[PDB]
Design a protein around this motif. Structure first.
Motif, mmCIF file in Angstrom:
data_model
loop_
_atom_site.group_PDB
_atom_site.id
_atom_site.type_symbol
_atom_site.label_atom_id
_atom_site.label_comp_id
_atom_site.label_asym_id
_atom_site.label_seq_id
_atom_site.Cartn_x
_atom_site.Cartn_y
_atom_site.Cartn_z
ATOM 1 N N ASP A 98 0.804 -1.215 0.000
ATOM 2 C CA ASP A 98 0.000 0.000 0.000
ATOM 3 C C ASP A 98 0.841 1.272 0.000
ATOM 4 N N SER A 99 2.149 1.112 0.164
ATOM 5 C CA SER A 99 3.057 2.243 0.185
ATOM 6 C C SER A 99 3.097 2.861 -1.201
ATOM 7 N N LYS A 100 2.850 4.163 -1.275
ATOM 8 C CA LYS A 100 2.845 4.860 -2.557
ATOM 9 C C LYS A 100 4.235 5.188 -3.082
ATOM 10 N N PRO A 101 4.405 5.159 -4.416
ATOM 11 C CA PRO A 101 5.702 5.475 -5.018
ATOM 12 C C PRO A 101 6.111 6.849 -4.533
ATOM 13 N N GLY A 102 7.377 7.000 -4.175
ATOM 14 C CA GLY A 102 7.854 8.279 -3.699
ATOM 15 C C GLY A 102 8.259 8.105 -2.261
ATOM 16 N N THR A 103 7.685 7.106 -1.603
ATOM 17 C CA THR A 103 8.015 6.831 -0.212
ATOM 18 C C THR A 103 9.126 5.800 -0.115
ATOM 19 N N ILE A 104 9.772 5.745 1.045
ATOM 20 C CA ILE A 104 10.855 4.801 1.298
ATOM 21 C C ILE A 104 10.425 3.362 1.008
ATOM 22 N N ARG A 105 9.337 2.924 1.628
ATOM 23 C CA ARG A 105 8.837 1.576 1.402
ATOM 24 C C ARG A 105 8.309 1.416 -0.015
ATOM 25 N N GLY A 106 7.585 2.422 -0.492
ATOM 26 C CA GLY A 106 7.016 2.352 -1.826
ATOM 27 C C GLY A 106 8.057 2.265 -2.923
ATOM 28 N N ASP A 107 9.244 2.800 -2.651
ATOM 29 C CA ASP A 107 10.333 2.791 -3.608
ATOM 30 C C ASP A 107 11.274 1.606 -3.481
ATOM 31 N N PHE A 108 11.473 1.142 -2.254
ATOM 32 C CA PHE A 108 12.447 0.097 -2.018
ATOM 33 C C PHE A 108 12.050 -1.314 -1.589
ATOM 34 N N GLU C 23 16.776 5.112 -15.915
ATOM 35 C CA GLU C 23 15.928 5.528 -14.810
ATOM 36 C C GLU C 23 14.811 4.532 -14.545
ATOM 37 N N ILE C 24 14.118 4.149 -15.605
ATOM 38 C CA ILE C 24 13.013 3.211 -15.509
ATOM 39 C C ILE C 24 13.456 1.843 -14.970
ATOM 40 N N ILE C 25 14.522 1.285 -15.542
ATOM 41 C CA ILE C 25 15.043 -0.006 -15.093
ATOM 42 C C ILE C 25 15.478 0.101 -13.628
ATOM 43 N N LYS C 26 16.261 1.128 -13.325
ATOM 44 C CA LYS C 26 16.770 1.380 -11.976
ATOM 45 C C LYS C 26 15.652 1.282 -10.963
ATOM 46 N N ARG C 27 14.536 1.940 -11.266
ATOM 47 C CA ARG C 27 13.375 1.947 -10.384
ATOM 48 C C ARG C 27 12.837 0.557 -10.055
ATOM 49 N N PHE C 28 12.736 -0.299 -11.061
ATOM 50 C CA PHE C 28 12.260 -1.648 -10.833
ATOM 51 C C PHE C 28 13.281 -2.451 -10.024
ATOM 52 N N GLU C 29 14.564 -2.185 -10.253
ATOM 53 C CA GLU C 29 15.628 -2.868 -9.536
ATOM 54 C C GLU C 29 15.590 -2.520 -8.063
ATOM 55 N N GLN C 30 15.556 -1.227 -7.764
ATOM 56 C CA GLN C 30 15.532 -0.767 -6.380
ATOM 57 C C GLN C 30 14.293 -1.200 -5.580
ATOM 58 N N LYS C 31 13.233 -1.589 -6.284
ATOM 59 C CA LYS C 31 11.983 -2.028 -5.663
ATOM 60 C C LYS C 31 12.112 -3.464 -5.148
ATOM 61 N N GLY C 32 12.974 -4.239 -5.800
ATOM 62 C CA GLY C 32 13.175 -5.617 -5.407
ATOM 63 C C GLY C 32 12.695 -6.583 -6.473
ATOM 64 N N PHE C 33 12.211 -6.055 -7.596
ATOM 65 C CA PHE C 33 11.723 -6.903 -8.681
ATOM 66 C C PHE C 33 12.916 -7.436 -9.456
ATOM 67 N N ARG C 34 12.743 -8.574 -10.119
ATOM 68 C CA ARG C 34 13.844 -9.136 -10.877
ATOM 69 C C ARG C 34 13.586 -9.191 -12.363
ATOM 70 N N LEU C 35 14.617 -8.808 -13.104
ATOM 71 C CA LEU C 35 14.600 -8.772 -14.551
ATOM 72 C C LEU C 35 14.690 -10.189 -15.081
ATOM 73 N N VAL C 36 13.598 -10.670 -15.665
ATOM 74 C CA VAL C 36 13.555 -12.012 -16.235
ATOM 75 C C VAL C 36 14.052 -11.991 -17.687
ATOM 76 N N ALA C 37 13.652 -10.972 -18.438
ATOM 77 C CA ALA C 37 14.057 -10.864 -19.831
ATOM 78 C C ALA C 37 14.034 -9.427 -20.343
ATOM 79 N N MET C 38 14.957 -9.109 -21.241
ATOM 80 C CA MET C 38 15.036 -7.776 -21.815
ATOM 81 C C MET C 38 15.666 -7.747 -23.202
ATOM 82 N N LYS C 39 15.014 -7.040 -24.113
ATOM 83 C CA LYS C 39 15.510 -6.911 -25.468
ATOM 84 C C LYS C 39 15.173 -5.516 -25.992
#
Lengths: 151, 151, 151, 151, 151, 151
Positions: A98-108, C23-39
């Protein structure tokens, strides 16, 4: 308006392990809050049970204690007008979902189990935690050079 | 649708003093808005009273004027589809207390007294402010190389 | 708781052109999501028509196809608990006008026509798109070293 | 180788006051070094004289001691292959005038008097300082989840 | 020481066009240098020939003038101990080919033709340029709240 | 011148695992280089042996092959004036111990074994590697909207 405040912010084992200490601290700094105290330690299960007394009768309690003892945490105290309320806003919802993007939890982070950080839920809890985690001589009192520009 | 727009964005003394000029400009740049004009100056109390005429019958007015004259500000004009509306959203609530994380105010300030920045509340106010702060020969007209990728 | 997930994230021509890939990729990385495939590729109008079958009757369709073929895109697959739902939250509203600051669209774009990115609307769509854009041998399976700290 | 190492990094009063704690910590984290210990405190003039014993006869000594006691500092211990040597490289020249862009000092400070940070000059000095600033039970031992990817 | 200084920093058309205004200003801010003056304008060929008088008998001059007039620039004045010398170091070599990573040019440009920025080569040139680009009443005089922490 | 160029940049398993993909790409984007081709894959030991033919008689070879196959890599092709030469400068020394702060390796890695990234040593090698890693139809040819501002 009415008066400033104070709050206890702790960076959990996962937040440290994933290298988000600088990011988290930076955010509080750039907001205009002031670092009153900061220490790095591996909170003992005993100390943690005390921290989670209000949840000692909750299913997760045992896991939570084992968890928070798995790695070192960064305990801090931040001062500022309404630190407790806004600080938590900056942290995001306790549940990363539920953490919104822009927040510590929402981002990390993603899962509640691994929500990287803790913020006091109220001034009453804040002072409790601060006392439980810090020794009074550890809270440094100084004045930020930009204080008059924040207030 | 329907048509673009243009708005007046001003970085208050505290924003300048706390070193948030680059951050604030950068944010508008990355969004796709174009810098039409920009100047650094210490707004005279006289000029400021004109800017705050609609609040000359309000208690804070005297302080507000003394305030905005305490240090230099960065006055700018940003063009773009709906700049006024979205620009304010980017700024966050006027009261940092309600500004959500991710917004300029939400990330950089705490008190309404020192809310680091100002954005026009409407297109009508925008044009007024632009005229009051800028001379017609100061609004530069050029075309951003990525314009067709933004629109 | 319930189960993880997998979603299709595509960086549109404008996103690439405006240099927002990192920027876009970085954001998904920092969230904890994992890159399965990219082209990286320039999707043919044929391939795009297939991707937009559900919209092949709407007036914008021909433009949308011509549009997405105008430049190369970055197609990716991200894995994680609820990727589809949270991924879109990170992307912001499809209409940049409603995307909140803090989100990819909210930070980097203005018009719906040029909304820099695409995220699957649902798990059903996600798997469809993933199949349409990637070959099964392209989805790499590995384990993120901080997996147990995200989960 | 040959062997790892351990070094003492301290963020001076000016570095704290100018809000560079997060930036500095972040840099060490992103490098692959590990935070062994960290505490926030206002080093007493006595403690500081001990820290600067090798300089207790130089013209600046008294000022230096008064200086380092003017505000709280962030004392840390970082572990890693060659931390002492590379750490100082990351810090830049002790004289900000010679610190190259890209380094902590080169990016954030101007005068030697206010050089925001301190790094041990050698392994010998490192262990000395670490003992002078930290208590053996304060150095936390844990393993970074990405250790095998840095090594 | 021996004494402070002041320098003329100008962000060329390409720097503005590629959206590097915020990044460049930000870098000077974080270093501790103070913005004395700043304006956004499209330098006339006439004004530019004056700026490049020492190169009026050099092959490229004609183009250089046509160049610098092709789009608006951001002219600024930065004060600080040794601003001219260090400012240039922060800029990197005039030839992006030799600019080291970490410097403005080293991080953002490739060709000397388009080297995104200009910094005075000396205090003597600085004062000349400042006078040629700014009116005395445009140089704002204030004091940075962190001045005593920088010096 | 003299002529542009093209180079092969590959983000190694550790670089991917430590989540530095966005950072690395971002850096090349902000420099003005253009992404010609990009794919995510786990390079087979066979394919890797081919890539390291010139080192098949060196001690480490077997390990290096096992290493690079341990996790997925991000293979890319970047175009620009002198990409090979400047690209490596951006990467830093192959041995992270000599990589200067400001560079990819200098900022993000410690040991040569885990140096997070690879850049072609020469144009001759660049074309070899590009052929070995990419299929001609994978190299996308488009024009960056700010090309005339970089050149």
């Amino acid at each position: 308006m009415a008066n400033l405040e104070r709050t206890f912010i702790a960076i959990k084992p996962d937040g440290v392990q994933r290298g988000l200490v600088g990011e988290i601290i930076k955010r509080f700094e750039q907001k205009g809050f002031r670092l009153v105290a900061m220490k790095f330690l591996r909170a003992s299960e005993e100390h943690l049970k005390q921290h989670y007394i209000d949840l000692k009768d909750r299913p997760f309690f045992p896991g939570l204690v084992k968890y928070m003892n798995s790695g070192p945490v960064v305990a801090m105290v931040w001062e500022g007008l309404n630190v407790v309320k806004t600080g938590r806003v900056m942290l995001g919802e306790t549940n990363p979902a539920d953490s919104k993007p822009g927040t510590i939890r929402g981002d990390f982070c993603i899962q509640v189990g691994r929500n990287i950080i803790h913020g006091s839920d109220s001034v009453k809890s804040a002072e409790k935690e601060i006392s439980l985690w810090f020794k009074p001589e550890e809270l440094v009192d100084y004045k930020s050079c930009a204080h008059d520009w924040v207030y």
